[PDB]
């Protein structure tokens, strides 16, 4: 079982494919984070604009030496390189070509549909941004529902991104003690956005994974099936954390 990302656009066909076990269970697809209604501008880079001949010669706009990129800030529409700017990947949704696949023991997963060079933007981790009090409410709800999969991302020093009910296909990225992706915290238009990026050349067909650095507050630990010869055993490690520490409250 395998399905490309444009399969998730028709919710009726998606829902019916899911009833047949060929697609994962329905969730609300979103293109950008949804906040729970909480929600002079010039952060230009210093790249000298590419001439229209340089464009024609293959030069990159806002490449590796772009001051915005080097600080993990995306350029805006006003970037000196304009339409050429290659540092608007989150905003333009310039994702890697990936598929959602069914794994043996971890539920559904993400695999590369073509070779991805190292340091390649995979997908943004989108979800609902929760404050600490809605986080606790969802902890209770997901526990009482007896969910198996959890989808809480805790950006360091920041609110939880919950992709359990709304998100994109990045919510399928499984954990590995020996991963081939990393998260990267980027700012787009003053807002934090978290992206998955490759850390090595991922060959076509390989599962994409990252290190959850998972913080378990559940009583019962989850054995890790990443299969790495240096596998840490359980998703959460040896010790359980409180609910407030898991949610990043000191």
């Amino acid at each position: 079982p395998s399905c490309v990302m444009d399969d998730f656009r028709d919710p009726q066909r998606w829902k019916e494919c899911a009833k047949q076990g060929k697609m994962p269970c329905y969730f609300d697809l979103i293109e950008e984070n949804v906040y729970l209604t909480e929600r002079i501008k010039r952060m230009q880079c210093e790249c000298t604009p590419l001439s229209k001949d340089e464009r024609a010669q293959g030069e990159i706009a806002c490449g590796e030496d772009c001051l915005n990129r080097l600080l993990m800030i995306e350029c805006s529409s006003r970037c000196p390189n304009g339409d050429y700017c290659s540092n608007r990947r989150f905003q333009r949704k310039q994702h890697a070509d990936v598929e959602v696949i069914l794994t043996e023991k971890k539920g559904w997963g993400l695999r590369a549909a073509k070779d991805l060079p190292s340091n390649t933007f995979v997908l943004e981790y989108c979800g609902e941004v929760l404050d600490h009090k809605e986080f606790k409410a969802r902890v209770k709800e997901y526990a009482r529902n007896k969910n198996i999969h959890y989808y809480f991302m805790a950006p360091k020093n920041d609110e939880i991104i919950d992709a359990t009910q709304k998100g994109n296909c990045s919510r399928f990225m499984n954990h590995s003690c020996e991963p081939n992706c990393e998260t990267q915290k980027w700012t787009v238009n003053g807002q934090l956005r978290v992206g998955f990026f490759t850390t090595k050349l991922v060959p076509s067909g390989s599962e994409l994974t990252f290190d959850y650095q998972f913080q378990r507050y559940g009583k019962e630990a989850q054995k890790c099936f990443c299969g790495s010869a240096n596998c840490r055993g359980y998703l959460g490690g040896e010790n359980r954390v409180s609910i407030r520490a898991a949610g990043g409250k000191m």
Binding site: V139, A143, Q213, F214, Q215, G247, G248
Partner: peptide, 11 residues
């Protein structure tokens, strides 16, 4: 406590 559950962390 909840039976299962946890939070992923970037770092």
């Amino acid at each position: 406590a909840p039976s299962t559950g946890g939070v992923m962390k970037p770092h």
